[PDB]
Amino acid sequence: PALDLIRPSVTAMRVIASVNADFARELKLPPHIRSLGLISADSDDVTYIAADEATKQAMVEVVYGRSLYAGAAHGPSPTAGEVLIMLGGPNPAEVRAGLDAMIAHIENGAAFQWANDAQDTAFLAHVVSRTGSYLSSTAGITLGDPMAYLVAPPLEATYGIDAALKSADVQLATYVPPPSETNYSAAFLTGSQAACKAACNAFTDAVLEIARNP
Amino acid sequence: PALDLIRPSVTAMRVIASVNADFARELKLPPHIRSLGLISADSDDVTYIAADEATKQAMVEVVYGRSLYAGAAHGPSPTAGEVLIMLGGPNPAEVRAGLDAMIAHIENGAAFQWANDAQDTAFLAHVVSRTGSYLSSTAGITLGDPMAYLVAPPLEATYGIDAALKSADVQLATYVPPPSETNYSAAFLTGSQAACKAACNAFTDAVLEIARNP
Amino acid sequence: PALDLIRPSVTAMRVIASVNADFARELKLPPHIRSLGLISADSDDVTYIAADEATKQAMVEVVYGRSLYAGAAHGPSPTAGEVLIMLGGPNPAEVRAGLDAMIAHIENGAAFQWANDAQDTAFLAHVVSRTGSYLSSTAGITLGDPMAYLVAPPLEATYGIDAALKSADVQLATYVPPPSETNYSAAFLTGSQAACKAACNAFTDAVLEIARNP
Ligand SMILES: [Hg+2]
Ligand SMILES: [Hg+2]
Ligand SMILES: [Hg+2]
Numbered sequence: 001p002a003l004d005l006i007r008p009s010v011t012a013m014r015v016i017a018s019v020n021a022d023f024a025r026e027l028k029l030p031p032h033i034r035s036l037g038l039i040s041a042d043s044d045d046v047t048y049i050a051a052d053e054a055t056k057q058a059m060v061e062v063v064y065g066r067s068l069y070a071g072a073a074h075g076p077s078p079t080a081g082e083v084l085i086m087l088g089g090p091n092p093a094e095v096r097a098g099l100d101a102m103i104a105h106i107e108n109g110a111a112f113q114w115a116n117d118a119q120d121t122a123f124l125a126h127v128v129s130r131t132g133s134y135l136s137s138t139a140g141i142t143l144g145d146p147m148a149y150l151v152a153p154p155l156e157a158t159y160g161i162d163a164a165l166k167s168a169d170v171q172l173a174t175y176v177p178p179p180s181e182t183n184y185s186a187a188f189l190t191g192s193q194a195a196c197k198a199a200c201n202a203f204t205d206a207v208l209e210i211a212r213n214p
Numbered sequence: 215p216a217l218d219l220i221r222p223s224v225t226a227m228r229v230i231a232s233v234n235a236d237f238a239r240e241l242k243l244p245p246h247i248r249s250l251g252l253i254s255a256d257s258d259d260v261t262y263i264a265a266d267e268a269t270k271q272a273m274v275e276v277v278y279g280r281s282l283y284a285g286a287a288h289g290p291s292p293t294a295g296e297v298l299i300m301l302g303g304p305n306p307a308e309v310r311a312g313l314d315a316m317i318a319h320i321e322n323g324a325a326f327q328w329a330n331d332a333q334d335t336a337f338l339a340h341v342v343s344r345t346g347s348y349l350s351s352t353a354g355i356t357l358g359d360p361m362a363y364l365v366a367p368p369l370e371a372t373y374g375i376d377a378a379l380k381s382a383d384v385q386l387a388t389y390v391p392p393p394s395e396t397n398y399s400a401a402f403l404t405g406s407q408a409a410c411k412a413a414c415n416a417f418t419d420a421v422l423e424i425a426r427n428p
Numbered sequence: 429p430a431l432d433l434i435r436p437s438v439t440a441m442r443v444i445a446s447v448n449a450d451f452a453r454e455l456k457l458p459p460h461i462r463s464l465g466l467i468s469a470d471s472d473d474v475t476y477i478a479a480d481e482a483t484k485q486a487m488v489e490v491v492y493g494r495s496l497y498a499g500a501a502h503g504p505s506p507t508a509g510e511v512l513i514m515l516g517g518p519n520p521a522e523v524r525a526g527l528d529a530m531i532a533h534i535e536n537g538a539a540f541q542w543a544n545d546a547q548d549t550a551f552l553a554h555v556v557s558r559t560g561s562y563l564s565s566t567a568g569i570t571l572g573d574p575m576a577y578l579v580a581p582p583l584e585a586t587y588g589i590d591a592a593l594k595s596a597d598v599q600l601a602t603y604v605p606p607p608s609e610t611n612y613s614a615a616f617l618t619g620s621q622a623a624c625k626a627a628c629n630a631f632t633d634a635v636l637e638i639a640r641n642p
Binding site: 069070071073074115118120121122153154155156158159161162165166171172175177178179181182183184210211214 | 439440441442444447448450451454466467468492494495496497498502503504505506507508512514609
């Protein structure tokens with residue numbers, strides 16, 4: 001398989017209609033957020049893309065979210081996948097909605113792709129066409145702007161990144177040097193959206209280059 | 215198996231009767247501690263519970279102790295398990311004693327339990343009936359007080375925690391948000407001991423809930 | 429196998445002849461460094477030893493380099509191994525040279541050794557006879573001085589370290605307490621070179637002790 005999509009799956013999900021007040025204080029949750037949606041999943045960068053997407057479909061924001069040390073392959077149980085997102089809303093109906101934009105997007109939104117027919121190397125070269133509060137809460141991102149979200153193993157990623165800046169006028173806005181918790185590297189770029197698509201292509205060209213050879 | 219106990223095992227053990235002075239300075243060890251017991255083990259939270267228990271049976275304190283990035287399943291060798299505790303004493307007899315309270319407690323003290331008959335999800339819902347200097351050295355714990363020590367994969371843990379505060383008047387004293395080094399989450403609660411047992415039950419009810427469904 | 433060598437392998441490699449200026453700024457790269465060599469590999473401490481060795485054969489320095497959370501066994505793809513080194517030079521010929529000192533040294537330089545015939549425990553007890561800018565950039569290392577670089581799982585390492593200070597006048601210069609990203613421990617010692625070899629021996633005696641028993 002060329003760059004056949006990798007179908008992420010949801011690993012667990014629950015809503016706390018009404019957080020205990022004590023647990024809530026420990027979370028630093030605003031007064032306006034008394035319901036939480038919790039969601040685990042197979043693929044972490046995708047789940048962070050679904051989360052942000054939930055921020056646009058519903059009235060929620062992500063209270064929390066972080067990944068697992070050596071990936072889902074190594075996860076501590078079939079439940080935790082390799083991410084945990086914690087959405088907060090003013091009530092349970094808003095949070096359900098955010099939960100369902102997240103599921104529909106994890107199952108059928110952004111996706112990693114195989115780097116090689118051998119399906120032992122994966123990557124993500126995905127245009128987020130309009131950013132919500134999650135992705136745009138990060139340094140230097142404008143709310144509502146387009147963005148590229150690029151991920152690949154360490155050497156793959158560094159090269160492919162360079163390649164991308166060289167292929168399209170974009171702005172490297174964020175760079176996770178190589179060892180993220182899951183052991184990949186990523187960066188966020190910005191510019192137009194037809195450019196975050198020129199950029200998005202050279203990155204995959206460069207990841208496919210290393211796979212086949214480098 | 216329902217919540218059949220998981221029998222932790224000790225992976226290695228040695229006493230340095232008399233630390234090199236140079237190694238000692240690098241450890242920031244008091245003047246009153248010239249002997250070290252080193253101990254590795256299968257199950258990290260249990261080993262931290264055994265350590266604290268050693269602080270009560272013998273004159274030692276834990277000089278060090280930390281866990282391994284993706285769990286014992288992923289450990290770097292059959293030796294290191296997924297924890298390393300370093301006990302310090304005024305001499306080798308004290309430290310042996312602490313080492314032996316630790317072994318007897320790792321092998322037959324606190325224990326994880328299976329979340330599901332499928333034995334792919336584990337958790338820990340254990341009352342520490344009286345805390346020594348290790349567990350009580352942590353923020354807001356009283357020396358000699360009771361405590362609950364709750365651990366579970368990320369979504370399991372968050373939910374189960376909320377559940378517990380809601381089931382018994384306890385105090386969330388410490389909270390390790392989701393990705394600890396081993397990829398679980400935990401929290402310490404306090405109150406009575408019959409309550410750290412009401413709390414300890416809803417947590418397991420809530421972990422069993424997600425296993426079977428959520 | 430006694431302490432049969434473990435043959436590290438290179439997992440990927442590429443040169444960016446000319447970094448994009450934007451990517452370069454994000455790297456904090458000097459004005460004197462416009463070419464990068466990227467290199468991934470099987471064995472991280474060895475690769476950090478090869479890197480430093482490249483600093484002596486060629487005009488390059490390491491711009492970056494870090495390891496992967498649970499080791500190459502758990503790496504995110506067959507490419508990233510468990511390290512990423514990023515060499516910088518004034519041009520592509522210098523960097524090629526550094527890349528080739530690194531390959532020749534990863535494939536046939538420093539090496540882990542099996543702790544036990546069972547080949548489930550590994551370690552590294554290697555004299556770096558003269559240090560370049562990489563290893564010597566670390567606290568308290570003199571440029572051009574000899575050094576011991578000792579690595580072993582957590583309990584193995586702590587013991588073996590103590591053992592080494594006790595066997596030869598050396599100076600513990602750096603100590604990575606137990607859980608490095610790859611889940612081993614290491615330390616750098618200094619003194620003579622016949623001593624960093626007395627030290628280097630007791631460490632392996634002590635790692636072999638735990639393997640067979642402790
Ligand atoms: Hg893009
Ligand atoms: Hg309890
Ligand atoms: Hg040495």
